[PDB]
Amino acid sequence: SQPSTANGGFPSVVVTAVTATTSISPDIESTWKGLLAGESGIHALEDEFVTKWDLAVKIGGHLKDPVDSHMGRLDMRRMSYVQRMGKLLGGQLWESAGSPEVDPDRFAVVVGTGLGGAERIVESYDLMNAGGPRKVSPLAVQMIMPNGAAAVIGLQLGARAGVMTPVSAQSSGSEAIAHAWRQIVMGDADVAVCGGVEGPIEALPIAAFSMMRAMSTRNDEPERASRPFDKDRDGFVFGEAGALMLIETEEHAKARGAKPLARLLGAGITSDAFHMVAPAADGVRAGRAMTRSLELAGLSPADIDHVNAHGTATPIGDAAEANAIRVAGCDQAAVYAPKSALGHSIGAVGALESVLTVLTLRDGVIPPTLNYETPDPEIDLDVVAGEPRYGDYRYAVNNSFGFGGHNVALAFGRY
Amino acid sequence: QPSTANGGFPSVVVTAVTATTSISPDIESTWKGLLAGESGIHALEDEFVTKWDLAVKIGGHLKDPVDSHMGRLDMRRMSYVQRMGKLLGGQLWESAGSPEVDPDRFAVVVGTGLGGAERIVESYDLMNAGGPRKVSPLAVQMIMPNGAAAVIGLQLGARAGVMTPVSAQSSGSEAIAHAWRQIVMGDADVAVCGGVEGPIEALPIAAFSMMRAMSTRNDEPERASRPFDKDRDGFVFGEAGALMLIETEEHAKARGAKPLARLLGAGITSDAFHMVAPAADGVRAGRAMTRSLELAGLSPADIDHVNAHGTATPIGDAAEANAIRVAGCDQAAVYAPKSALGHSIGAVGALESVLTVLTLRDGVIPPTLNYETPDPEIDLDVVAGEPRYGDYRYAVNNSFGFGGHNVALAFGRY
Numbered sequence: 001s002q003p004s005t006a007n008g009g010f011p012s013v014v015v016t017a018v019t020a021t022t023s024i025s026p027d028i029e030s031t032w033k034g035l036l037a038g039e040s041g042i043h044a045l046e047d048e049f050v051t052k053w054d055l056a057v058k059i060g061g062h063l064k065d066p067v068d069s070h071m072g073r074l075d076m077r078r079m080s081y082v083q084r085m086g087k088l089l090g091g092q093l094w095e096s097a098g099s100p101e102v103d104p105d106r107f108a109v110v111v112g113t114g115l116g117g118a119e120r121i122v123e124s125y126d127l128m129n130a131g132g133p134r135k136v137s138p139l140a141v142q143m144i145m146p147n148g149a150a151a152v153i154g155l156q157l158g159a160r161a162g163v164m165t166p167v168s169a170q171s172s173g174s175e176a177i178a179h180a181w182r183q184i185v186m187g188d189a190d191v192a193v194c195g196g197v198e199g200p201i202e203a204l205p206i207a208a209f210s211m212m213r214a215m216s217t218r219n220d221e222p223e224r225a226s227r228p229f230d231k232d233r234d235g236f237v238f239g240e241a242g243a244l245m246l247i248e249t250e251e252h253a254k255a256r257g258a259k260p261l262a263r264l265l266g267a268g269i270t271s272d273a274f275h276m277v278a279p280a281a282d283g284v285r286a287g288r289a290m291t292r293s294l295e296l297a298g299l300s301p302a303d304i305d306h307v308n309a310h311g312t313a314t315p316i317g318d319a320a321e322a323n324a325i326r327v328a329g330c331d332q333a334a335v336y337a338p339k340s341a342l343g344h345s346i347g348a349v350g351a352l353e354s355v356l357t358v359l360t361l362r363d364g365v366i367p368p369t370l371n372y373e374t375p376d377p378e379i380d381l382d383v384v385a386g387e388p389r390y391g392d393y394r395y396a397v398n399n400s401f402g403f404g405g406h407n408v409a410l411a412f413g414r415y
Numbered sequence: 416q417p418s419t420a421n422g423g424f425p426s427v428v429v430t431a432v433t434a435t436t437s438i439s440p441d442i443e444s445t446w447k448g449l450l451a452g453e454s455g456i457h458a459l460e461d462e463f464v465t466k467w468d469l470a471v472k473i474g475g476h477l478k479d480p481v482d483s484h485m486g487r488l489d490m491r492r493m494s495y496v497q498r499m500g501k502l503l504g505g506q507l508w509e510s511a512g513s514p515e516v517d518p519d520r521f522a523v524v525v526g527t528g529l530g531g532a533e534r535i536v537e538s539y540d541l542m543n544a545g546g547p548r549k550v551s552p553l554a555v556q557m558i559m560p561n562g563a564a565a566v567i568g569l570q571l572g573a574r575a576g577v578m579t580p581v582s583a584q585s586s587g588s589e590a591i592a593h594a595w596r597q598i599v600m601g602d603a604d605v606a607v608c609g610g611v612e613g614p615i616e617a618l619p620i621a622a623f624s625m626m627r628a629m630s631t632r633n634d635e636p637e638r639a640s641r642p643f644d645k646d647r648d649g650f651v652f653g654e655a656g657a658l659m660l661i662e663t664e665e666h667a668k669a670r671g672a673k674p675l676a677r678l679l680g681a682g683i684t685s686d687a688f689h690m691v692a693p694a695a696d697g698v699r700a701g702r703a704m705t706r707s708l709e710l711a712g713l714s715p716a717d718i719d720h721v722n723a724h725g726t727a728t729p730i731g732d733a734a735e736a737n738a739i740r741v742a743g744c745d746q747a748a749v750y751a752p753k754s755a756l757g758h759s760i761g762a763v764g765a766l767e768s769v770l771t772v773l774t775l776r777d778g779v780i781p782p783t784l785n786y787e788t789p790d791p792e793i794d795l796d797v798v799a800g801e802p803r804y805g806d807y808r809y810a811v812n813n814s815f816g817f818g819g820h821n822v823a824l825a826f827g828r829y
């Protein structure tokens with residue numbers, strides 16, 4: 001008999017605080033109310049760079065409340081953007097958790113990102129080409145390295161039981177929460193800050209993904225552009241975000257008087273070995289990530305009330321994920337695709353969506369998937385649409401997938 | 416509580432290794448060269464050195480450049496770390512006898528410091544010159560830092576997870592740690608793991624040397640890298656990449672693979688001290704070593720050998736000596752391979768894990784080069800002068816990284 005959360009072979013792990021910054025709001029509770037009210041964070045892009053380059057994509061969700069409005073003079077000169085976002089969210093989360101005094105030697109941080117401080121690579125490159133090697137900042141390395149945001153949070157909050165950065169492109173944010181769960185259940189930590197951060201919409205990221213022919217170009221109706229699972233979808237839309245949650249053993253939470261929002265029960269990680277940038281059509285390995293999360297949780301597929309889909313609104317992505325949900329035996333779950341409203345934040349998105357999964361369990365409600373108007377027969381899923389779907393949801397799986405063939409599924413439960 | 420010794424974790428063995436280094440593309444020749452006291456560190460002849468008059472004019476390029484093995488298409492459609500990952504993954508698999516494994520039980524975990532960053536700057540220049548439609552359609556998949564691990568997973572058919580842990584100079588060891596976790600948690604029976612890294616270039620040298628941590632002993636390049644020596648003056652770049660194949664002992668026995676060593680346990684901690692200096696007290700670094708022992712089921716008295724991260728910076732080696740004391744491992748024989756091979760950043764912990772395996776397999780530790788004046792603050796048994804033979808049974812490989820990351824791996828003789 002394998003250990004599971006249900007059989008007590010793993011310790012119970014609970015989510016005790018959440019924080020996120022999104023295109024709708026810097027306040028996760030206001031993001032959540034806005035989603036439930038059918039709001040979209042997607043807008044016409046007004047940036048100069050759009051007109052400068054005449055970009056084919058002219059839509060996206062910038063953060064409602066820009067990170068750098070909270071940054072001091074020295075932060076702007078000593079950290080890359082994902083580090084600044086990490087420091088902002090790290091401090092917000094800790095305050096939301098009641099600023100607890102925890103044992104630093106039992107406290108881990110696991111934060112994913114898609115790339116790291118890449119703007120400082122191009123900065124350094126230009127500085128050196130113009131003025132030679134002594135023009136490169138002595139801080140360049142530490143601003144650039146992709147583990148930089150996780151390290152800044154570890155330093156800020158004092159985590160001494162490991163600081164890790166898993167990178168798996170668009171599944172990085174969920175993968176980080178999986179590895180944090182593992183670190184606790186293996187006995188390496190009792191409490192962990194985890195999730196994901198990502199850079200803002202800029203011209204070069206738009207250019208590179210646009211050349212994969214991946215992106216929606218419904219520029220005339222920005223809030224209608226992102227249409228996961230809909231027959232008429234035409235690709236993904238960027239929406240900025242960063243998100244963190246605090247997880248800890250149930251015993252640890254109870255000893256300090258924390259009130260859990262949900263339980264994090266198990267995590268599955270698999271890979272397709274199919275193609276570098278398309279998911280396997282059959283959804284079999286993706287489905288097996290979901291199944292592995294259920295095995296570690298001790299659940300059956302019939303237990304799962306809700307799936308928070310990766311749902312990017314590409315034609316081949318959504319079709320693969322529908323197959324994966326069928327493989328896992330989860331296709332009678334109520335499905336939400338939050339990128340319909342919040343867009344795609346790449347290395348942060350799995351973390352944001354994990355936070356939304358937690359709030360669905362806490363509050364008994366799934367927001368409507370925006371723009372879901374014409375069901376697609378290849379996609380026979382129960383996609384929540386039109387108005388929120390209320391229920392006493394007991395268990396839910398959050399899915400995230402990434403270029404490279406990475407599949408991550410996280411199983412959460414109502415507390 | 417489970418340990419390897421108590422049977423609570425399955426037994427995991429190392430069954431193949433590959434590496435490319437500044438001494439040789441052939442790990443067995445690297446090893447022979449190390450034992451004979453060879454250095455891979457040379458004067459750098461690159462035009463970029465004189466173009467920028469770099470303060471640092473030494474390092475070790477790969478003896479056999481990755482791209483001498485690469486087709487025209489790969490040169491345009493993979494980043495350098497992807498090309499290195501493809502070359503090494505193919506070599507490792509052939510060395511392992513090209514086994515037919517269950518893909519759904521096979522994982523890949525490969526760390527790197529940065530990823531396909533030359534494609535970032537190239538995409539930036541191409542767009543600045545010609546607009547957004549000049550950026551390659553393959554740019555994202557070449558740039559993404561999971562790119563090398565993903566290339567190897569697709570090449571070899573791994574469907575039980577492809578992971579890229581990033582922890583700067585400890586990434587290559589951290590990859591092997593997480594591969595070990597993936598197998599003992601039951602998610603895989605076999606894994607390819609290790610680390611790749613880019614080559615020495617002008618901008619990397621400028622960025623590290625502006626931190627003031629690099630040796631500039633340009634007069635005597637083979638003498639420059641002096642871990643634990645009293646006169647050390649900073650680290651030296653030495654290119655590498657390394658992968659190993661690990662699998663359950665049951666899996667290896669079933670296919671007739673002869674183990675090279677056992678991978679017994681892994682410890683990961685962090686300092687929360689400074690972004691680019693290790694904690695002077697060595698406490699959390701020593702606890703990484705202690706955790707690898709706890710998971711192995713070993714005590715510090717059992718350890719014969721420590722393969723030190725040993726970068727040759729003044730404050731780095733002092734902190735590590737403290738760490739080895741905190742862990743109770745300071746009676747062990749110490750080797751600092753960066754003395755001969757220099758520092759390969761994201762790859763280096765993987766390379767040094769392969770060297771730890773070979774020490775255990777062959778009963779010998781190479782001499783730490785350039786170790787001439789003991790430093791009283793260090794007070795370690797640094798193997799030097801000639802290789803040291805012995806019946807080594809248990810060894811710890813240490814790796815640390817910017818951000819305060821500490822990774823220790825506990826290996827045993829098979």
Ligand SMILES: CCCCCCCCCCCCCCCC(=O)O[C@H](COC(=O)CCCCCCCC[C@H](C)CCCCCCCC)COP(=O)(O)O
Binds near residue numbers: 169538
């Ligand atoms: C939801 C969006 C997600 C996008 C994800 C992309 C991930 C990349 C990380 C984003 C980059 C951070 C930028 C933050 C600072 C900032 O904004 O810099 C502006 C001006 O522009 C720049 O410096 C642009 C510099 C670009 C840096 C290189 C980016 C390369 C992108 C690749 C070519 C394509 C994407 C690779 C993704 C790989 C991983 C995921 C699969 C300062 O403005 P000012 O204050 O000077 O007026």
Ligand SMILES: CCCCCCCCCCCCCCCC(=O)O[C@H](COC(=O)CCCCCCCC[C@H](C)CCCCCCCC)COP(=O)(O)O
Binds near residue numbers: 528529614616617761
């Ligand atoms: C042991 C060394 C370790 C170094 C580690 C540094 C990280 C390496 C990053 C990958 C480097 C890949 C380079 C391969 C391409 C190549 O070689 O192309 C040259 C031409 O130059 C270039 O393109 C240089 C391109 C610059 C790339 C950006 C590098 C940014 C470096 C950062 C500012 C500093 C390092 C940050 C490290 C953070 C992570 C670890 C803490 C031949 O051109 P040709 O023969 O075709 O004419």
Ligand SMILES: C=C/C(C)=C/[C@@]1(C)SC(=O)C(CCC)=C1O
Binds near residue numbers: 236279344403
């Ligand atoms: C191996 C490839 C995969 C999983 C591709 C996916 C489904 S992941 C992702 O977020 C998107 C939209 C583009 C950012 C894909 O096209």
Ligand SMILES: C=C/C(C)=C/[C@@]1(C)SC(=O)C(CCC)=C1O
Binds near residue numbers: 628691731758815820
């Ligand atoms: C937190 C900082 C740490 C651990 C710094 C170390 C000791 S790790 C490393 O390889 C080097 C040499 C620079 C490549 C350090 O200076």
Ligand SMILES: [K+]
Binds near residue numbers: 400
């Ligand atoms: K999701």
Ligand SMILES: [K+]
Binds near residue numbers: 723725768
């Ligand atoms: K080492």
